[PDB]
Every structure is written in C-alpha cells, then in structure tokens.
Amino acid sequence: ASKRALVILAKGAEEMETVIPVDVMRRAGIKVTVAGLAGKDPVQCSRDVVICPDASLEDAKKEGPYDVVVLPGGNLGAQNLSESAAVKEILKEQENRKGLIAAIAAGPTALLAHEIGFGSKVTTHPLAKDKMMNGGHYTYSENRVEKDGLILTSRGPGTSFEFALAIVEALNGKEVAAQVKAPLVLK
Amino acid sequence: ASKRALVILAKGAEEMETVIPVDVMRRAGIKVTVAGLAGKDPVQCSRDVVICPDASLEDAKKEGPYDVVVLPGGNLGAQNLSESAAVKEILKEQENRKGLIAAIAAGPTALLAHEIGFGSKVTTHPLAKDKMMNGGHYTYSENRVEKDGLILTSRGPGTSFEFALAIVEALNGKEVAAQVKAPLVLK
C-alpha cells in the first residue's frame, strides 16, 4: 500500500541533494531505500559527510520494483552513476515499466549516459547543462523543477526541497505534499 | 587562518538541519568537525539517515576552541543535547569566550536547558516555542533567522540554508557568503 523509493548513493554524491529527498519522502510515508552503488560500506559524499546506506545496490536491486528511482547530484557522484552498468539496467527497467525517474543537479547527466528518456524536457545544475545537452537528445529548461511525464529533474541543493516535494506529489498526491510541507518552514 | 566549526551530532538529530550547515560551511572554506555526542559511532538521525561523525565529542572538545558551535534541531536530538553535561560545559565556555553559538529548530531549547544567552531575542521551530519560552528567559521572534549578538537561531529544515549562510557571513564575511550562495541555486 505504501509507495517505495530507491535512492542510489555513490561516492561524491552531493549530501544535501541526497538527504533532503530521503528525509522529505520518509515524512511522506514513503518506504525509502538508500542503496550504496559500491556496496554496503559507508559513502563519502562531496563535502565529506559520511552516510551509511541501508543496503547495497546489488541487494536493493533484487527487492524491486520501486515507484521512483532517485539519482542525487554531485559532479563526481553523477559520474559514478553514469559509469555503472547496474544503474543502466535499473533505469532501463524503470523506464520500461513506466516508473518515475527523478534526478537532480548533475544527476540528470546519468540519464544521458544510459540513454534514458530522450526527447524529454529537462533541467540540470547550470554547470551541467553542456554535458546534458551533448548531442541535443533533450530539450533544456530553466525551471527549478521540470517534470516531463515520468522524467523529473531539478537544478541543485537550493531546489532540493521543491524536487522532493514534487516526488511526493507524484507518488502520494498534493494533499500529502501540502501536509508534509507545512512543518518544514519553507518560504 | 581558517575558521573552525563544531557541529554536535546526537541521536534523533534532524539530518537536513545537520547536513545543510555542514555542507555550506565547508563550501565556505570553514574547517568543520562533526562530533558525535555519544561517541565516534554512526548516528541514527530522526528520519533514519545514518551519519558517521568525524570524531567523538569527547575528543573534539580537546581540539577546541571553535569559532562557532552548532546545535542541529530534531525533537529527540535537541533533548539529548539538553541533557548532556558535556554540551553544557562547551556552550558555557563558548559563551564565556564570546564565541558564536548557532542553533536551529528545536536546537535552541538546549540553550535554555544550559542557561545560555538569557535575555536574547531568539526563534525556534513553531512547535518548540512553548518549551523555549518556559520562564520567559528569552524574547521570541518569528524571523526565519534571528541573530542577537553571539546567539544565532533559526526555525526549521526550510530555513537551514538561510541559517548556514548566516553562519558563513558571521565568520567569513558577506563576500564569501554571496560566493557560496550563487552555486546553490537558491530561490
């Protein structure tokens, strides 16, 4: 009955873009699984914050399917996601089953690497735009949060709450989103 | 030299109110030490995100003094901070040395527990106002970020960026604060 979310955590991930969505989704009653790309070991994020995943991606991948697969940003983190064959398979399967895919900041560049959702209108961190647009497989947007069907993208740490709340609305509805939002004291 | 910051991490701390300041301060070139209240073991935050401290508070306390002591929020986390004799001593020392003390959400209630900065104008998460105002030792504010001398407070996850940038400006200046802010893509 409860929606499930898979958050793929790789070394170099932007910790704020990882923690805000995980926190907000759990406030929404979503069962969130933080899966480590390299395994079950703790992950050293971009600003040295060390986060211990709930499980390895290899294991979490066997506990699917998920209502949403979340790709945090962070330059080095995104590169790790982009080079992962496991991630490629996870996203292809999610896209095939018509499941939501959400990526923030540099995270969307992983979609390009795995040829996911070509033709979609997307946004990324301003510094990741060129990389994301290489080949013109997507149409760029400056919106803080962009949702084109089952592809949901966002721009950076500063858009993480909007990003997370958009995921919540897509999975649990806007009433729940509004309920979760109020206590956050967002402007 | 570079400024130093001490972030006291206790079980039940709100992970967003912990990670955002740590991340933003490090982007500001501030040497941040995430110290675990109970020790050097991983800490289970309010929304189950597990964070590994850089060191135990016991050891971090020996590497002082710090230019700012940061108290994250989270109902249960703030309660642990409020009940800690180690925290009481650290804050008293910081207050006596005229060093900055910054607390967010429920975090300010730890200031009350340790009789820190009485008379200061402060803010807290709306649900922590009554606890903070017990006895009328402070004057309450609705401002998203309140700074009365060396006592800096904020309201919640949604004010974490404002809170963190306020700390940066207080330690490294308005110029550095603006430089760090731009890449965040804040609204």
From Swiss-Prot, chains A, B:
The record marks 148-149 as: Cleavage. Its main location: membrane. Changing residue 52 to S: No effect on mitochondrial translocation neither on deglycase activity. Changing residue 25 to I: In PARK7; does not affect protein stability and degradation; does not interfere with homodimerization; decreased detoxification activity on methylglyocal-adducted CoA. The keyword Nucleotide-binding does not apply. The modification Cysteine sulfinic acid (-SO2H) is found at residue 105. Changing residue 129 to R: Partially compensates for loss of stability. The modification N6-acetyllysine is found at residue 147. Changing residue 178 to T: No effect on detoxification activity on methylglyocal-adducted CoA. Signal peptide: none annotated. The modification N-acetylalanine is found at residue 1. This is Parkinson disease protein 7. It comes from Homo sapiens.
